[PDB]
């Protein structure tokens, strides 16, 4: 089956490469049936130590995508769900590599598109680590678990696994998925409130697919309220073209916390009968309460003279002796020591071809004792 | 010849980008363009221009005249090599390759230049060839090719004093440091303004004077303005020919804040229309405002906000929205009170603000070695 | 005249020294000079930064305060950063090109 899986794939590719969905889905399909007979002989018959399993986890994995680009959206995927649970069941028992990897993003890719429970199953899953999954499934895998906590409420946990999924991604083209990690990676940091310039590398990514999405954060970097609505009507459908719009819809909170940190930082003794009008809130009577919960949830500290109307704010300086930037260090002290440690641990593979530590010689040592014997008799 | 060749690029800027202003530029630029053998650099300028339908014979007479100069190189190279002088071929096109550089494109102008670079054993030709490569490296804005021959340039002035090859050179590096927003370096290269000469590219020495004052008024502080640009006889007399800039400079120095914005709109609008300042005049006056605000505002602690309209610059709410975005922009170190109508200042000790840039650069290099350590070793 | 500027300011740093705050009406009396040109001149001290402090418009209290800030520690560690960034840029030129 190194010959019959390669001589399966080698005709299983060029049918399904161009795809030819015109009288080719059943030929593709039956050829997938033959390769599935090889795959069942792989699942059952002497996969030990041969890379029968391992060599055909690459063939199985790559045929899952043509399988998944004729036999997913055109055909029923939910049968390939239970076939894939069986494929995972025979995985991780006999062998723990190459079946622990692909069978989980390849499990993930339509469950994310669905709303099935299997995000918490992915929490309690053992195969969350597939142990150095070849920097392609491994790289995208962190993105595939990034959107998990996106739809399950990013609490700044996965922006490092989005960033990590980004930095493990290759040099091919951004239009594959690197657009969507380039968009969604910050989409979760717009959820936090922080934002950099995104459009800084205008290669083949920072001219085409940004303008609604940078136009979004252009409104977020303002302290304006209905400017967000002027984005949200303008490209409500463009954000529905990807399907991020349910994460887009919740940003009015971070817009108004951006505004209250902005004004509460800017002015000091400012009336509440000014901030509703300046924030175009159209109601000061609950602008006691947005301000009040801005005190409640953390953000701003000082008091409102609710009787008068001015919201006083105190001048809090000298955050240095406040021991926050020691923590901003110690997060990075430990990590920078770690990346020196990894620059050590990745370094010592070279040490090789060190054949012989020859001290001096043998015959020249015999000449040294010989001429030494001449000078000693002399 | 490359000595009038910058005005050509500035009038390309004058042609395209002011959209309504596109008639006298396509007059005088054509007036320079369909003479002096110019063939190559204006096809897409003709595309941005009108039709100009019958340019065929106009190009044919000039590729013909160009063919005369090329065929007389072809008349020159063989009598040059039969009796060889100092390689008289490259001695002919060491001077007419700049005709290949203005008239020809950068390829026949580049090769022949790197060709003739190996001819003259002294830098008296070499470094001027390098000056030509710098000047075309500006025309095609070859921002990496200028990095090479700037260092390759500077490598020759150490032997000799060559202050016509260094003080001239500092004009180029000042134009690059003002091309980018590197203004403390642009005035620093513009520090002398004496050994700088009545140039070819700023044929008004006083235009050079305007540029070094516009960059210096941001680049240096008072302890430097109140000694340096106020006591230079070399600087006072040339702007004594200037009414506006003399007023524009002295309106900050003589605390004349209300008439300062009056000239600021004019100078800033001139900087708007100017080539090469057009990338950064916004960056200019957004610093000029907060500089003029900080200068007066670090004198008083209990100055009200309705002081600055009638005395500093009119519009109370204009001052309000302008200051609110600067404290809210994280600069302009003070704190404005609102409903008792008073502005307070504070002082940040240089322990937090100095800390800020440190954590910025540490995060940047963290990103850098993070990215490289992912990139190498697969 | 120019010597009178330096003598004016030599007295002006002399009497301002022993305190933290005062009103302009006493220093006008103690140098025996006016208040407008002294107010503008003190403003020029804190514009030219030769003297530092702050001024008031309600009554003219000059709040004087000084400490030498820590400067050597952070920036001298900060330019090493932009050295090493360029060093990593050179690591492209023996690492990215090579293997």
């Amino acid at each position: 089956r190194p010959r019959t899986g390669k001589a399966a794939s080698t005709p299983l590719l060029p049918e399904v490469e161009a795809y030819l969905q015109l009288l080719v889905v059943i030929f593709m399909m039956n050829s997938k049936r033959y390769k599935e007979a090889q795959k069942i002989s792989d699942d059952l018959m002497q996969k030990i130590s041969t890379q029968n399993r391992r060599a055909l986890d690459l063939v199985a994995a790559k045929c899952y995508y043509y399988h998944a680009r004729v036999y997913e959206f055109l055909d029923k995927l939910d049968v390939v769900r239970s076939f894939l649970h069986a494929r995972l069941r025979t995985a991780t028992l006999r062998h723990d590599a190459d079946g622990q990897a692909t069978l989980l993003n390849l499990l993930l890719r339509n469950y994310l598109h669905y709303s099935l429970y299997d995000q918490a199953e992915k929490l309690v899953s053992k195969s969350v680590f597939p142990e150095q999954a070849n920097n392609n499934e491994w790289a995208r895998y962190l993105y595939y678990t990034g959107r998990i906590k996106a739809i399950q409420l990013e609490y700044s946990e996965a922006r490092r696994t989005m960033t990590n999924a980004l930095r493990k991604a290759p040099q091919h083209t951004a239009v594959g998925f690197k657009q969507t990690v380039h968009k969604l990676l910050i989409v979760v940091e717009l959820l936090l409130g922080e934002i950099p310039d995104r459009l800084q590398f205008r290669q083949p990514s920072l001219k085409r697919s940004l303008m609604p999405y940078f136009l979004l954060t252009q409104a977020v970097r303002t302290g304006n309220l209905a400017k967000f609505n002027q984005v949200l009507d303008q490209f409500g459908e463009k954000f529905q073209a990807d399907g991020t719009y349910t994460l887009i819809i919740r940003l009015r909170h971070n817009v108004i916390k951006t505004g209250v940190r902005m004004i509460s930082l800017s002015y000091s003794r400012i009336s509440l009968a000014d901030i509703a009008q300046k924030l175009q809130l159209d109601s000061p009577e609950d602008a006691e309460f947005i301000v009040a919960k801005a005190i409640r949830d953390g953000v701003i500290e000082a008091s409102i003279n609710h009787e008068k109307g001015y919201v006083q704010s105190k001048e809090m300086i000298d955050i240095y002796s406040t021991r926050e930037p020691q923590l901003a260090f110690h997060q990075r002290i430990s990590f920078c020591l770690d990346i020196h440690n990894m620059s050590v641990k990745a370094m010592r593979f070279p040490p090789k071809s060190y054949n012989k530590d020859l001290e001096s010689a043998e015959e020249r040592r015999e000449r040294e004792q010989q001429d030494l014997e001449f000078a000693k008799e002399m | 010849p490359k000595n009038p060749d910058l005005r050509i690029a500035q009038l390309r800027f004058l042609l395209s980008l002011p959209e309504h202003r596109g008639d006298a530029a396509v007059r005088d630029e054509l007036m320079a363009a369909v003479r002096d053998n110019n063939m190559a650099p204006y096809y897409e300028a003709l595309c941005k221009s009108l039709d100009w339908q019958i340019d065929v014979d106009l190009l044919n007479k000039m590729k013909k005249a160009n063919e005369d100069e090329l065929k007389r190189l072809d008349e020159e190279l063989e009598d040059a090599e039969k009796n060889l002088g100092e390689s008289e071929i490259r001695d002919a096109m060491m001077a007419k390759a700049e005709y290949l550089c203005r008239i020809g494109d950068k390829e026949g102008a580049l090769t022949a230049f790197r060709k003739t670079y190996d001819k003259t054993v002294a830098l008296g030709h070499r470094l001027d060839i390098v000056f030509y490569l710098l000047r075309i490296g500006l025309f095609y804005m070859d921002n990496d090719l200028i990095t090479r021959n700037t260092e390759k340039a500077k490598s020759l002035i150490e032997e000799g004093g060559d202050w016509d090859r260094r003080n001239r050179l500092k004009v180029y590096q000042g134009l690059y440091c003002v091309a980018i927003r590197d203004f403390k370096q642009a005035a620093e290269l513009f520090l002398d303004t004496v050994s700088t000469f009545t140039s070819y590219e700023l044929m008004d020495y006083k235009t050079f004077v305007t540029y070094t004052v516009y960059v210096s008024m941001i680049a240096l502080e008072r302890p430097d303005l109140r000694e340096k640009v106020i006591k230079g006889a070399e600087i006072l007399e040339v702007l004594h020919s200037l009414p506006a800039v003399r007023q524009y400079l002295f309106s900050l120095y003589e605390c004349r804040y209300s008439v300062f914005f009056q000239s600021l709109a004019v100078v800033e609008q001139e900087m708007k229309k100017d080539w090469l300042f057009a990338p950064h005049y916004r960056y200019y006056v957004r610093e000029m405002r907060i500089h003029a605000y900080s200068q007066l505002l670090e004198s008083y602690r209990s100055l009200t906000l309705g002081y600055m309209a009638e005395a500093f610059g009119v519009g109370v709410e204009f001052i309000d929205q302008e200051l609110s975005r600067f404290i809210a922009a994280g600069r302009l170190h003070c704190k404005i009170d609102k409903v008792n109508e008073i502005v307070e200042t504070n002082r940040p000790d240089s322990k937090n603000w100095q800390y800020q840039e440190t954590i910025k650069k540490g995060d940047l290099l963290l990103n850098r070695v993070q990215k490289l350590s992912r990139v190498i070793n697969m | 005249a120019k010597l009178y500027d330096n003598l004016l300011e030599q007295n002006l740093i002399r009497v301002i020294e022993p305190f933290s705050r005062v009103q302009i009406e006493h220093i006008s009396s103690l140098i025996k000079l006016s208040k407008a040109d002294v107010e503008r001149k003190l403003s020029q001290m804190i514009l030219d930064k030769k003297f530092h402090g702050i001024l008031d418009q309600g009554e003219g209290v000059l709040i004087i305060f000084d400490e030498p800030p820590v400067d050597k520690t952070y920036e001298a560690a900060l330019e090493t950063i932009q050295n090493m960034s360029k060093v990593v840029d050179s690591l492209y030129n023996k690492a990215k090109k090579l293997t």
Partner: peptide, 30 residues
């Protein structure tokens, strides 16, 4: 922070000095 910031880059430079000792030795010797 600065000392740990240098040390990693130094050892990285040392690994590049190893990969030159690997890639242009495998083809040369065999």
């Amino acid at each position: 922070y600065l000392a740990s910031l240098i040390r990693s880059v130094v050892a990285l430079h040392n690994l590049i000095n190893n990969k030159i000792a690997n890639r242009d030795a495998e083809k040369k010797e065999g």
